[PDB]
C-alpha cells in the first residue's frame, strides 16, 4: 500500500501505482555459562506461554539484506505491506 505506513519511504523513492561452522559449536551447551545465568542471590517470567511467530521463528530474514546490491533478485520496488492482523490486545 503506497499511502499506508512507510508512505514516507515510498514518496522518497517516487513509486506511484495506486570447522568453526560445525553444528556443535552452536549448541548452547558449548556457548552458555550456567553459573552466570543463575541469579545466585545477587542484586525470566516466560515459556509458560503457548504460541510464537512464524516468520522470525522460521524465515531466513538474514537473506533479506542483499549482501551485494548489484546482484539483487529485487531492486527498488513497491514492496506492498500485508496488513496481516495478528498478535493480541489489538481490538481488531
Amino acid at each position: 500500500w503506497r499511502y499506508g505506513p512507510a508512505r514516507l519511504w515510498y514518496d522518497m523513492l517516487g513509486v506511484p501505482e495506486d570447522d568453526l561452522l560445525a553444528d556443535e559449536n552452536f549448541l548452547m551447551v558449548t556457548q552458555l555459562h550456567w553459573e552466570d545465568d543463575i541469579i545466585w542471590d545477587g542484586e525470566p517470567w516466560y515459556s509458560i506461554f503457548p504460541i510464537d511467530n512464524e516468520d522470525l521463528v522460521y524465515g531466513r530474514w538474514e537473506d533479506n539484506i542483499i549482501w551485494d546490491a548489484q546482484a539483487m533478485p529485487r531492486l527498488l520496488e513497491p514492496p506492498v505491506l500485508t496488513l496481516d492482523p495478528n498478535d493480541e490486545n489489538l481490538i481488531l
Binding site: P50, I51, N89, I91
Partner: protein, 77 residues
C-alpha cells in the same frame, strides 16, 4: 491419550467489555499524553508555574492569520 491423541483447539478470546473499555481508554489517554508532551517539548512552551517544563507543559498559543478556518471547519468528514 499421549500415544495417539491430538486436540486442535483454538485460543480463548477476550469478551470482557469492562477490560476492553479499560484497555482502549488507557491506551488513548497514554498516546495523547505522549503526543502532547512531545509537541510541547519540541516547540515554544508556556507554563502555569514558574519554570515548569517537565510537569504540565503547555504548547504555546500561536496566532493564526485566518482563525475562522481552523475554528469552524470540520476535520473528520
Amino acid at each position: 491419550p499421549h500415544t495417539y491423541i491430538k486436540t486442535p483447539t483454538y485460543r480463548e478470546p477476550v469478551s470482557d467489555y469492562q477490560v476492553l473499555r479499560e484497555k482502549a481508554a488507557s491506551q488513548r489517554r497514554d498516546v495523547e499524553r505522549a503526543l502532547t508532551r512531545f509537541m510541547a517539548k519540541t516547540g515554544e512552551t508556556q507554563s502555569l508555574f514558574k519554570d515548569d517544563v517537565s510537569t504540565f507543559p503547555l504548547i504555546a498559543a500561536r496566532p493564526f492569520t485566518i482563525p475562522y478556518l481552523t475554528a469552524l471547519l470540520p476535520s473528520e468528514l
